[PDB]
Design a binder for these strands. Sequence first.
DNA 1: TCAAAACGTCGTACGACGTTTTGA
DNA 2: TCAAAACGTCGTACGACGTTTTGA
Lengths: 152, 151
Amino acid sequence: NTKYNKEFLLYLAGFVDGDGSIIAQIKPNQSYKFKHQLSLTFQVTQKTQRRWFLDKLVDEIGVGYVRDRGSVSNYILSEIKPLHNFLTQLQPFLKLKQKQANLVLKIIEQLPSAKESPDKFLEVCTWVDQIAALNDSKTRKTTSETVRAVLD
Amino acid sequence: NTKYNKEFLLYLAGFVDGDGSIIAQIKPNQSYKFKHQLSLTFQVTQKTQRRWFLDKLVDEIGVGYVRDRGSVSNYILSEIKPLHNFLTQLQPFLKLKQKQANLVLKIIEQLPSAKESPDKFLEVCTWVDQIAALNDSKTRKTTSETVRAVL
DNA sequence: TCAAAACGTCGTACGACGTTTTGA
DNA sequence: TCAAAACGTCGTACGACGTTTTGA
């Protein structure tokens, strides 16, 4: 892993609480077993002028990347093992997004177990619902209950 | 004149850097000698469902109040002295808003110096701009020129 | 099959201002 | 003539999804 110092973890938990985003998706893909991918994405969208912030932010955390969208850039971390580490250390300090982080961790820890059984998959898809609910969910298309459809 | 928890200062500096607002307005009013009020505001906006978090702020910081906006809510701190204290302690831990902090600080300090000698009042009004420059301003109306041309 | 990356999308919510009153 | 509250309101990000690709 990598072990994050407490001064830094404190600041970050603050900044994540206000300006930052924890996303959980079920992505229709024909390529998979259950024909859905479970993606966890942690992300912070800054204004490209400020990319230095997201870049320093890449260097400090030591994992993940910055994508330039044009006027805006994101810091993205989709890598599961580092993500899990990041979110365990941050969770204790989160005053707002704490539950979503705990839900991301629960989802991750159970990921392998979910590939095995169909109805076990849906139990995990519900948590990626519960996560969605804790954001203001707009364009959401694929839910846990969309999956149950095909699974039959 | 409260001293703050460095643990809580770090979290807050992180929070403010992301979600916080430092606003410097030149607000024309007909009362004042120079016919402008000088106004500093540090605000945090949160959906009213989360209003407790705003209350926590009123508590941890000790001063300021929550305004219920309907579906959303603001924590406001407009009191100059508490604001100068708060920003002094927070300023070293600010990354993204760091500059704004030190302007509101340097403004607050020069306030009485501005109450007297308008050419200095102008010099200070200038600092409001530079703050508005660090935010991306949208509806900005009254500026340091707006005042000056009337001086 | 899977973890990841790559990339496309858009309706409004709210930051950052306004204006005007209170209570000295 | 002040500080400080009260209250009002708009433009363009942007957040939270989305689809598709990559390479083992």
